[PDB]
PDB file of C-alpha atoms in Angstrom:
ATOM      1  CA  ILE Q   1     116.800  67.903  -6.933  1.00 40.88           C
ATOM      2  CA  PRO Q   2     119.647  69.937  -8.543  1.00 40.51           C
ATOM      3  CA  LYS Q   3     121.863  72.280  -6.476  1.00 39.64           C
ATOM      4  CA  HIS Q   4     122.392  75.599  -8.301  1.00 34.95           C
ATOM      5  CA  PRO Q   5     119.767  74.971 -11.006  1.00 37.41           C
ATOM      6  CA  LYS Q   6     120.300  76.857 -14.273  1.00 35.67           C
ATOM      7  CA  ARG Q   7     116.676  76.953 -15.454  1.00 34.79           C
ATOM      8  CA  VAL Q   8     113.775  77.043 -12.989  1.00 35.85           C
ATOM      9  CA  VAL Q   9     110.082  77.228 -13.862  1.00 33.20           C
ATOM     10  CA  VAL Q  10     107.990  78.454 -10.927  1.00 31.44           C
ATOM     11  CA  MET Q  11     104.287  77.677 -11.196  1.00 31.88           C
ATOM     12  CA  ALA Q  12     103.532  78.984  -7.683  1.00 33.24           C
ATOM     13  CA  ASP Q  13     103.376  82.778  -8.206  1.00 33.33           C
ATOM     14  CA  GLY Q  14     103.946  83.425  -4.503  1.00 34.29           C
ATOM     15  CA  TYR Q  15     107.502  82.028  -4.593  1.00 33.03           C
ATOM     16  CA  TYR Q  16     108.946  83.831  -7.648  1.00 34.11           C
ATOM     17  CA  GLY Q  17     110.415  86.578  -5.460  1.00 34.29           C
ATOM     18  CA  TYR Q  18     112.190  83.946  -3.306  1.00 32.99           C
ATOM     19  CA  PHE Q  19     114.274  82.518  -6.135  1.00 33.69           C
ATOM     20  CA  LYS Q  20     114.872  86.032  -7.459  1.00 32.99           C
ATOM     21  CA  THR Q  21     116.375  87.026  -4.110  1.00 33.60           C
ATOM     22  CA  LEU Q  22     118.546  83.884  -4.065  1.00 33.95           C
ATOM     23  CA  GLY Q  23     119.634  84.627  -7.650  1.00 33.71           C
ATOM     24  CA  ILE Q  24     118.315  81.425  -9.225  1.00 35.89           C
ATOM     25  CA  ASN Q  25     117.585  82.110 -12.845  1.00 38.38           C
ATOM     26  CA  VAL Q  26     113.852  81.693 -13.438  1.00 36.77           C
ATOM     27  CA  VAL Q  27     112.674  80.995 -16.936  1.00 35.95           C
ATOM     28  CA  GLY Q  28     108.926  80.901 -16.361  1.00 37.31           C
ATOM     29  CA  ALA Q  29     106.330  82.305 -13.963  1.00 36.65           C
ATOM     30  CA  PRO Q  30     102.492  82.549 -13.778  1.00 35.01           C
ATOM     31  CA  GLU Q  31     100.519  85.705 -14.667  1.00 32.97           C
ATOM     32  CA  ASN Q  32     100.314  87.241 -11.209  1.00 29.64           C
ATOM     33  CA  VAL Q  33     104.050  87.831 -11.371  1.00 30.58           C
ATOM     34  CA  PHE Q  34     103.742  90.089 -14.418  1.00 28.92           C
ATOM     35  CA  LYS Q  35     101.125  92.119 -12.556  1.00 28.50           C
ATOM     36  CA  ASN Q  36     102.703  92.602  -9.133  1.00 26.61           C
ATOM     37  CA  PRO Q  37     103.986  96.189  -8.863  1.00 23.97           C
ATOM     38  CA  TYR Q  38     106.989  94.978  -6.927  1.00 19.98           C
ATOM     39  CA  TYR Q  39     107.929  92.627  -9.790  1.00 17.71           C
ATOM     40  CA  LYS Q  40     107.204  93.932 -13.315  1.00 21.52           C
ATOM     41  CA  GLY Q  41     108.303  97.149 -11.651  1.00 25.33           C
ATOM     42  CA  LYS Q  42     111.802  96.131 -12.751  1.00 23.61           C
ATOM     43  CA  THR Q  43     112.164  92.327 -12.477  1.00 23.97           C
ATOM     44  CA  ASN Q  44     110.831  90.358 -15.471  1.00 24.64           C
ATOM     45  CA  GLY Q  45     113.534  90.372 -18.135  1.00 22.84           C
ATOM     46  CA  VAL Q  46     114.131  86.651 -18.494  1.00 24.28           C
ATOM     47  CA  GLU Q  47     110.782  84.849 -18.071  1.00 23.64           C
ATOM     48  CA  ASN Q  48     107.732  83.418 -19.790  1.00 24.26           C
ATOM     49  CA  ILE Q  49     104.183  83.753 -18.385  1.00 23.38           C
ATOM     50  CA  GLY Q  50     101.367  81.179 -18.095  1.00 20.43           C
ATOM     51  CA  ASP Q  51      98.538  80.319 -15.625  1.00 20.85           C
ATOM     52  CA  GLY Q  52      99.860  77.190 -13.920  1.00 21.09           C
ATOM     53  CA  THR Q  53      98.198  74.356 -15.861  1.00 24.13           C
ATOM     54  CA  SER Q  54      99.548  74.265 -19.427  1.00 24.36           C
ATOM     55  CA  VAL Q  55     102.172  71.525 -19.009  1.00 25.08           C
ATOM     56  CA  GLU Q  56     103.163  72.077 -22.644  1.00 24.40           C
ATOM     57  CA  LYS Q  57     104.205  75.685 -22.037  1.00 23.76           C
ATOM     58  CA  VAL Q  58     106.718  74.337 -19.471  1.00 26.62           C
ATOM     59  CA  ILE Q  59     108.120  71.852 -21.998  1.00 27.47           C
ATOM     60  CA  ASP Q  60     109.377  74.632 -24.283  1.00 30.97           C
ATOM     61  CA  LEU Q  61     111.442  76.099 -21.458  1.00 26.59           C
ATOM     62  CA  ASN Q  62     113.315  72.802 -20.790  1.00 29.97           C
ATOM     63  CA  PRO Q  63     113.746  73.373 -17.029  1.00 28.01           C
ATOM     64  CA  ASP Q  64     116.149  71.573 -14.734  1.00 27.66           C
ATOM     65  CA  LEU Q  65     113.778  72.196 -11.819  1.00 26.77           C
ATOM     66  CA  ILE Q  66     110.011  72.806 -11.390  1.00 24.51           C
ATOM     67  CA  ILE Q  67     108.278  74.238  -8.383  1.00 24.13           C
ATOM     68  CA  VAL Q  68     104.515  74.032  -7.794  1.00 25.34           C
ATOM     69  CA  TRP Q  69     102.053  74.035  -4.939  1.00 21.75           C
ATOM     70  CA  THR Q  70     100.281  70.863  -3.762  1.00 18.98           C
ATOM     71  CA  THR Q  71      96.866  72.558  -3.797  1.00 20.07           C
ATOM     72  CA  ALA Q  72      98.056  70.745 -11.471  1.00 23.72           C
ATOM     73  CA  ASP Q  73      99.479  67.391 -12.700  1.00 25.01           C
ATOM     74  CA  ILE Q  74     102.616  66.635 -10.697  1.00 21.07           C
ATOM     75  CA  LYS Q  75     103.333  63.222 -12.286  1.00 20.82           C
ATOM     76  CA  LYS Q  76     103.249  64.713 -15.832  1.00 21.65           C
ATOM     77  CA  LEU Q  77     105.658  67.409 -14.616  1.00 22.58           C
ATOM     78  CA  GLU Q  78     108.019  65.137 -12.657  1.00 21.98           C
ATOM     79  CA  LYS Q  79     108.696  63.698 -16.115  1.00 19.41           C
ATOM     80  CA  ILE Q  80     109.919  67.006 -17.522  1.00 18.72           C
ATOM     81  CA  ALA Q  81     112.404  67.832 -14.728  1.00 19.68           C
ATOM     82  CA  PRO Q  82     113.064  67.362 -10.959  1.00 23.24           C
ATOM     83  CA  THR Q  83     109.834  68.756  -9.506  1.00 22.34           C
ATOM     84  CA  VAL Q  84     109.278  69.980  -5.983  1.00 24.08           C
ATOM     85  CA  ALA Q  85     105.950  70.200  -4.250  1.00 26.22           C
ATOM     86  CA  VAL Q  86     105.498  72.841  -1.589  1.00 24.19           C
ATOM     87  CA  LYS Q  87     102.579  72.577   0.811  1.00 21.47           C
ATOM     88  CA  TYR Q  88     101.218  76.123   0.984  1.00 23.55           C
ATOM     89  CA  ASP Q  89     101.609  78.021   4.271  1.00 21.75           C
ATOM     90  CA  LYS Q  90     103.509  75.058   5.692  1.00 19.18           C
ATOM     91  CA  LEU Q  91     106.699  77.052   6.380  1.00 19.91           C
ATOM     92  CA  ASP Q  92     106.722  80.300   8.361  1.00 19.83           C
ATOM     93  CA  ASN Q  93     107.949  82.781   5.756  1.00 20.31           C
ATOM     94  CA  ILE Q  94     111.565  83.576   6.552  1.00 20.93           C
ATOM     95  CA  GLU Q  95     111.847  79.806   6.992  1.00 20.74           C
ATOM     96  CA  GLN Q  96     110.435  79.244   3.484  1.00 21.81           C
ATOM     97  CA  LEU Q  97     113.411  81.288   2.222  1.00 23.31           C
ATOM     98  CA  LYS Q  98     115.904  79.173   4.121  1.00 21.13           C
ATOM     99  CA  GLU Q  99     114.240  76.027   2.784  1.00 25.99           C
ATOM    100  CA  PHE Q 100     114.762  77.175  -0.809  1.00 25.45           C
ATOM    101  CA  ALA Q 101     118.249  78.493  -0.049  1.00 27.81           C
ATOM    102  CA  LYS Q 102     119.300  75.111   1.341  1.00 27.88           C
ATOM    103  CA  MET Q 103     117.569  73.319  -1.521  1.00 26.71           C
ATOM    104  CA  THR Q 104     119.471  75.324  -4.133  1.00 26.89           C
ATOM    105  CA  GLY Q 105     122.796  75.769  -2.356  1.00 27.05           C
ATOM    106  CA  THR Q 106     122.535  79.539  -1.866  1.00 24.89           C
ATOM    107  CA  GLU Q 107     122.387  79.845   1.938  1.00 23.44           C
ATOM    108  CA  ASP Q 108     124.725  82.875   1.688  1.00 24.31           C
ATOM    109  CA  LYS Q 109     122.291  84.782  -0.491  1.00 24.41           C
ATOM    110  CA  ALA Q 110     119.456  84.126   1.963  1.00 26.81           C
ATOM    111  CA  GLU Q 111     121.327  84.956   5.177  1.00 24.64           C
ATOM    112  CA  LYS Q 112     122.571  88.095   3.423  1.00 26.31           C
ATOM    113  CA  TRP Q 113     119.045  89.366   2.625  1.00 24.78           C
ATOM    114  CA  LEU Q 114     117.797  88.429   6.123  1.00 24.38           C
ATOM    115  CA  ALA Q 115     120.528  90.665   7.502  1.00 21.00           C
ATOM    116  CA  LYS Q 116     119.383  93.462   5.178  1.00 18.73           C
ATOM    117  CA  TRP Q 117     115.756  92.795   6.107  1.00 20.84           C
ATOM    118  CA  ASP Q 118     116.277  92.990   9.861  1.00 23.06           C
ATOM    119  CA  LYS Q 119     118.288  96.178   9.414  1.00 21.49           C
ATOM    120  CA  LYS Q 120     115.337  97.665   7.539  1.00 22.91           C
ATOM    121  CA  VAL Q 121     112.767  96.423  10.012  1.00 24.79           C
ATOM    122  CA  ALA Q 122     114.646  97.799  13.027  1.00 20.06           C
ATOM    123  CA  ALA Q 123     115.186 101.177  11.372  1.00 19.77           C
ATOM    124  CA  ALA Q 124     111.561 101.629  10.315  1.00 20.20           C
ATOM    125  CA  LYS Q 125     110.263 100.282  13.635  1.00 23.60           C
ATOM    126  CA  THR Q 126     112.052 103.109  15.456  1.00 19.42           C
ATOM    127  CA  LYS Q 127     111.247 105.688  12.771  1.00 20.57           C
ATOM    128  CA  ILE Q 128     107.526 104.839  12.938  1.00 22.82           C
ATOM    129  CA  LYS Q 129     107.113 104.513  16.760  1.00 21.72           C
ATOM    130  CA  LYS Q 130     108.520 108.037  16.849  1.00 22.94           C
ATOM    131  CA  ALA Q 131     105.914 109.378  14.398  1.00 24.50           C
ATOM    132  CA  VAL Q 132     102.832 107.445  15.691  1.00 27.36           C
ATOM    133  CA  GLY Q 133     103.593 106.365  19.240  1.00 28.99           C
ATOM    134  CA  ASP Q 134     101.082 103.826  20.507  1.00 28.85           C
ATOM    135  CA  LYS Q 135      98.522 105.009  17.995  1.00 29.82           C
ATOM    136  CA  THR Q 136      96.474 102.121  16.620  1.00 25.47           C
ATOM    137  CA  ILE Q 137      96.315 100.950  13.059  1.00 24.88           C
ATOM    138  CA  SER Q 138      93.726  98.979  11.093  1.00 27.05           C
ATOM    139  CA  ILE Q 139      93.916  96.870   7.984  1.00 25.12           C
ATOM    140  CA  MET Q 140      90.813  96.274   5.913  1.00 23.64           C
ATOM    141  CA  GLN Q 141      89.639  95.402   2.430  1.00 24.26           C
ATOM    142  CA  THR Q 142      86.279  95.732   0.783  1.00 22.40           C
ATOM    143  CA  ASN Q 143      84.399  93.241  -1.378  1.00 22.11           C
ATOM    144  CA  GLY Q 144      80.773  94.040  -2.057  1.00 22.40           C
ATOM    145  CA  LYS Q 145      78.768  94.402   1.142  1.00 23.41           C
ATOM    146  CA  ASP Q 146      81.365  92.558   3.251  1.00 22.28           C
ATOM    147  CA  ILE Q 147      84.377  94.253   4.830  1.00 21.07           C
ATOM    148  CA  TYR Q 148      87.391  92.259   6.017  1.00 19.31           C
ATOM    149  CA  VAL Q 149      89.409  93.551   9.017  1.00 18.20           C
ATOM    150  CA  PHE Q 150      92.731  91.723   8.889  1.00 18.47           C
ATOM    151  CA  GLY Q 151      94.920  90.729  11.783  1.00 17.68           C
ATOM    152  CA  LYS Q 152      98.540  89.629  11.772  1.00 18.57           C
ATOM    153  CA  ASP Q 153      98.165  86.138  10.364  1.00 20.70           C
ATOM    154  CA  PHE Q 154      96.458  86.726   7.050  1.00 19.11           C
ATOM    155  CA  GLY Q 155      98.711  88.752   4.766  1.00 18.14           C
ATOM    156  CA  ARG Q 156      97.923  92.299   3.663  1.00 17.04           C
ATOM    157  CA  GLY Q 157     100.867  93.571   5.714  1.00 18.46           C
ATOM    158  CA  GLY Q 158      99.433  92.042   8.861  1.00 18.34           C
ATOM    159  CA  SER Q 159     102.560  90.274  10.099  1.00 16.55           C
ATOM    160  CA  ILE Q 160     104.585  93.359   9.136  1.00 17.12           C
ATOM    161  CA  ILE Q 161     102.473  95.899  11.010  1.00 18.41           C
ATOM    162  CA  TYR Q 162     101.494  93.945  14.095  1.00 12.92           C
ATOM    163  CA  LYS Q 163     104.674  91.881  14.631  1.00 14.11           C
ATOM    164  CA  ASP Q 164     107.743  93.356  12.897  1.00 14.45           C
ATOM    165  CA  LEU Q 165     106.743  96.958  13.576  1.00 16.53           C
ATOM    166  CA  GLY Q 166     105.026  96.161  16.877  1.00 18.94           C
ATOM    167  CA  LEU Q 167     102.288  98.674  16.101  1.00 16.03           C
ATOM    168  CA  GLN Q 168      99.054  98.480  18.135  1.00 13.22           C
ATOM    169  CA  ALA Q 169      95.499  97.571  17.101  1.00 13.72           C
ATOM    170  CA  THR Q 170      92.141  98.461  18.704  1.00 11.71           C
ATOM    171  CA  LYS Q 171      90.992  96.131  21.540  1.00 12.29           C
ATOM    172  CA  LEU Q 172      88.193  94.764  19.360  1.00 13.96           C
ATOM    173  CA  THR Q 173      90.527  94.129  16.444  1.00 12.35           C
ATOM    174  CA  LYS Q 174      92.999  92.177  18.595  1.00 10.02           C
ATOM    175  CA  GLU Q 175      90.071  90.399  20.249  1.00  8.78           C
ATOM    176  CA  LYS Q 176      88.542  89.410  16.926  1.00  9.28           C
ATOM    177  CA  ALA Q 177      91.091  89.363  14.132  1.00  8.18           C
ATOM    178  CA  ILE Q 178      94.045  88.219  16.246  1.00  6.11           C
ATOM    179  CA  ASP Q 179      93.620  86.486  19.633  1.00  6.85           C
ATOM    180  CA  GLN Q 180      90.689  84.537  18.237  1.00  2.00           C
ATOM    181  CA  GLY Q 181      89.658  84.137  14.603  1.00  2.00           C
ATOM    182  CA  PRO Q 182      91.313  82.419  11.596  1.00  2.00           C
ATOM    183  CA  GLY Q 183      93.283  85.616  11.049  1.00  2.00           C
ATOM    184  CA  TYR Q 184      90.538  88.035   9.952  1.00  2.00           C
ATOM    185  CA  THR Q 185      86.902  89.049  10.605  1.00  2.00           C
ATOM    186  CA  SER Q 186      84.177  89.962   8.141  1.00  2.00           C
ATOM    187  CA  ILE Q 187      82.050  92.745   9.612  1.00  2.00           C
ATOM    188  CA  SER Q 188      79.106  94.937   8.631  1.00  6.29           C
ATOM    189  CA  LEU Q 189      79.420  98.612   7.620  1.00  8.54           C
ATOM    190  CA  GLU Q 190      77.742  99.411  10.932  1.00  6.12           C
ATOM    191  CA  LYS Q 191      80.480  98.024  13.153  1.00  7.64           C
ATOM    192  CA  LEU Q 192      83.160  99.891  11.219  1.00  8.46           C
ATOM    193  CA  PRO Q 193      83.517 102.692  13.813  1.00  8.62           C
ATOM    194  CA  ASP Q 194      84.012  99.937  16.380  1.00  9.83           C
ATOM    195  CA  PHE Q 195      87.142  98.582  14.704  1.00  7.76           C
ATOM    196  CA  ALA Q 196      88.548 101.630  12.922  1.00  8.47           C
ATOM    197  CA  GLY Q 197      91.837 102.773  14.352  1.00 11.32           C
ATOM    198  CA  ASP Q 198      93.808 106.036  14.210  1.00  6.60           C
ATOM    199  CA  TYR Q 199      95.466 105.002  10.944  1.00  6.87           C
ATOM    200  CA  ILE Q 200      93.970 102.801   8.252  1.00  3.70           C
ATOM    201  CA  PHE Q 201      95.269 100.953   5.219  1.00  2.00           C
ATOM    202  CA  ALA Q 202      92.167 100.270   3.162  1.00  3.45           C
ATOM    203  CA  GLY Q 203      91.539  99.048  -0.336  1.00  5.10           C
ATOM    204  CA  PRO Q 204      89.564  96.607  -2.475  1.00  6.31           C
ATOM    205  CA  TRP Q 205      89.856  92.823  -2.008  1.00  3.33           C
ATOM    206  CA  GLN Q 206      90.902  92.735  -5.661  1.00  2.00           C
ATOM    207  CA  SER Q 207      91.283  95.076  -8.645  1.00  2.00           C
ATOM    208  CA  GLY Q 208      81.309  97.971  -2.804  1.00  2.00           C
ATOM    209  CA  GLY Q 209      80.952 101.708  -2.293  1.00  2.00           C
ATOM    210  CA  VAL Q 210      82.240 101.514   1.263  1.00  2.00           C
ATOM    211  CA  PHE Q 211      84.625 104.411   0.752  1.00  2.00           C
ATOM    212  CA  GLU Q 212      81.496 106.301  -0.205  1.00  2.00           C
ATOM    213  CA  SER Q 213      79.231 105.475   2.707  1.00  2.00           C
ATOM    214  CA  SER Q 214      78.735 108.381   5.077  1.00  2.00           C
ATOM    215  CA  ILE Q 215      79.870 106.162   7.937  1.00  2.00           C
ATOM    216  CA  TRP Q 216      83.337 105.574   6.427  1.00  2.00           C
ATOM    217  CA  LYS Q 217      83.901 109.183   5.427  1.00  2.00           C
ATOM    218  CA  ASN Q 218      83.007 110.137   8.974  1.00  4.16           C
ATOM    219  CA  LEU Q 219      85.594 107.830  10.585  1.00  3.05           C
ATOM    220  CA  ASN Q 220      88.201 109.794  12.507  1.00  2.49           C
ATOM    221  CA  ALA Q 221      91.053 108.178  10.541  1.00  2.86           C
ATOM    222  CA  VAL Q 222      89.681 109.461   7.237  1.00  5.49           C
ATOM    223  CA  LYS Q 223      88.840 112.864   8.692  1.00  2.00           C
ATOM    224  CA  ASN Q 224      92.456 113.246   9.853  1.00  3.01           C
ATOM    225  CA  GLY Q 225      93.617 112.047   6.427  1.00  4.66           C
ATOM    226  CA  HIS Q 226      95.275 108.949   7.940  1.00  2.00           C
ATOM    227  CA  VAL Q 227      93.931 106.441   5.423  1.00  2.00           C
ATOM    228  CA  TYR Q 228      96.231 105.047   2.772  1.00  2.00           C
ATOM    229  CA  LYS Q 229      95.207 103.295  -0.449  1.00  2.00           C
ATOM    230  CA  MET Q 230      96.392  99.708  -0.304  1.00  5.64           C
ATOM    231  CA  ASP Q 231      97.033  97.956  -3.606  1.00  6.20           C
ATOM    232  CA  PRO Q 232      95.434  94.472  -3.553  1.00  3.48           C
ATOM    233  CA  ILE Q 233      97.982  92.980  -5.992  1.00  2.00           C
ATOM    234  CA  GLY Q 234     101.010  94.284  -4.159  1.00  2.00           C
ATOM    235  CA  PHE Q 235      99.946  92.860  -0.795  1.00  2.00           C
ATOM    236  CA  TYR Q 236      98.914  89.584  -2.400  1.00  2.00           C
ATOM    237  CA  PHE Q 237     102.383  88.081  -1.866  1.00  2.00           C
ATOM    238  CA  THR Q 238     104.775  87.855   1.081  1.00  2.00           C
ATOM    239  CA  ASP Q 239     108.053  86.961  -0.637  1.00  2.00           C
ATOM    240  CA  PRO Q 240     111.328  88.864   0.195  1.00  2.00           C
ATOM    241  CA  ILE Q 241     110.880  91.373  -2.643  1.00  2.00           C
ATOM    242  CA  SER Q 242     107.191  92.057  -1.986  1.00  2.00           C
ATOM    243  CA  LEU Q 243     107.831  92.368   1.745  1.00  2.00           C
ATOM    244  CA  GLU Q 244     110.465  95.017   1.040  1.00  2.00           C
ATOM    245  CA  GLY Q 245     108.092  96.933  -1.220  1.00  2.00           C
ATOM    246  CA  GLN Q 246     105.252  96.630   1.302  1.00  2.00           C
ATOM    247  CA  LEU Q 247     107.376  97.831   4.231  1.00  2.00           C
ATOM    248  CA  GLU Q 248     108.395 100.869   2.205  1.00  2.00           C
ATOM    249  CA  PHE Q 249     104.770 101.734   1.490  1.00  2.00           C
ATOM    250  CA  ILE Q 250     103.777 101.174   5.144  1.00  2.00           C
ATOM    251  CA  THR Q 251     106.621 103.396   6.430  1.00  2.00           C
ATOM    252  CA  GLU Q 252     106.267 106.175   3.869  1.00  2.00           C
ATOM    253  CA  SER Q 253     102.488 106.366   4.497  1.00  2.00           C
ATOM    254  CA  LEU Q 254     102.905 106.527   8.269  1.00  2.00           C
ATOM    255  CA  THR Q 255     105.629 109.187   8.200  1.00  2.00           C
ATOM    256  CA  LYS Q 256     104.869 111.630   5.345  1.00  2.00           C
ATOM    257  CA  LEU Q 257     104.385 115.290   6.371  1.00  2.00           C
ATOM    258  CA  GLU Q 258     100.968 116.779   7.231  1.00  2.00           C
TER     259      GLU Q 258
END
């Protein structure tokens, strides 16, 4: 595996932002990347798209390093250039950045951003606790008749809100989506008032008339205008860039004037 690679093709959408932070020039990325508001938003200049299968499309980018998930034809790829397989969700998240930093010889770029990150977390943590106190906050997405109430270990700003910001959740949400389940809980539209907190970040599971039901409109959070539209594509990833964009949205939402 090359240190300081000059041309990297990333077939695992969820890692693009990692190499971008480190500064490794990426020459190819899957479609998701060109759809994420935290990416195309300003970071796409030098890359080709794709879906993650067309081995031929990677050939025309003559990479010196390929990165793909284990969950594609690795052998075919290993032929093109040094290829690295990354078991999904194996590394923590800030660890996954230090793995890539070490792998590419850019540990200074990674430790630098971590320093910036913790300075942003700390600042927002104090700015938010001041504006919401111990008020509770929910995270949920809709998909047909099912409604998912996320915890801290399942993306959608969960680890940000319940760990980095130390914000509280309703007893039932901690009991079900945290201290117990696989990281989330699918509930019925009836039990919504039982989970719903003071503030809510709701949105579709991807781009079921729940935001129409009389039971949702009647929730205290919505009545007090404390519900914020969560973009499913933006909260899809948890890379350094997306995390920054997500923490900005979380903070702004929870502190804008009423």
